Amino acid sequence: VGSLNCIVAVSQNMGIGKNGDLPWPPLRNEFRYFQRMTTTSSVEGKQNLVIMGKKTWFSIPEKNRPLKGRINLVLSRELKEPPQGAHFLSRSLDDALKLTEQPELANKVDMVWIVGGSSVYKEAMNHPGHLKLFVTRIMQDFESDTFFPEIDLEKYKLLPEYPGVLSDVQEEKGIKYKFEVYEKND
């Protein structure tokens, strides 16, 4: 199994969701970028795995589920099986990651992408090890009911460039946003 990564899009006041949807109106290229980053392997004959909490899964439009060309794994202690359309179910982040080391998954999985929500991000961010955060900065405040955890810039370095990620500002529907990559290794 390769890289462990988080990917998120966040507002200026650290917002990631509101009422089970994004705080902002849909941004076409942000969706494209999320799709491109989580799908693209760098290891022939392998697939990336996406790990998300239950609320995150159900927040994706049913038509868009499962995230195609990726192995879809949902985190939940209440569910007894994977949701309709999902591939795997685990009862914790550790278990999910433990699960990648099984004869089954071990040789099929390139990158692992945590795609939210807050609690999943928090646990990954605070766990020792090599981790990147792919952060889309939505450059306004938006009304939100769930937030991205604190990024500790003592451990997470903002990268000055990263291949296949743009460095300038984008804008859709009057909303400016930028892509960022942070790395820690501890």
Ligand SMILES: *O=P(*)(*)([O])(OP([O])(=O)O[C][C]1O[C](N2[C]=[C][C]C(C([N])=O)=[C]2)[C]([O])[C]1[O])O(*)[C][C]1O[C](N2[C]=NC3=C2N=[C]N=C3[N])[C](O(*)P(*)([O])([O])=O)[C]1[O]
């Ligand atoms: O953590 P969750 O997925 O839900 P949260 O934090 O409320 O997120 C949903 C909101 O945020 C948006 N969003 C999601 C990802 C990225 C993103 C962005 N802008 O990039 C935005 C969505 O649109 C929503 O508005 O789910 C909570 C349930 O999942 C289970 N959970 C989380 N973590 C674990 C876990 N189960 C087991 N282990 C772990 N580590 C829990 O399920 P339960 O209650 O046990 O059945 C949580 O309830």
Ligand SMILES: CCn1c(Sc2cccc(OC)c2)c(C)c2c(N)nc(N)nc21
């Ligand atoms: C495209 C919006 N979006 C989303 S919601 C979404 C995800 C995939 C498909 C989809 O179809 C409308 C919606 C998530 C979970 C997500 C994420 N973790 N990181 C970034 N940078 N963007 C994200």
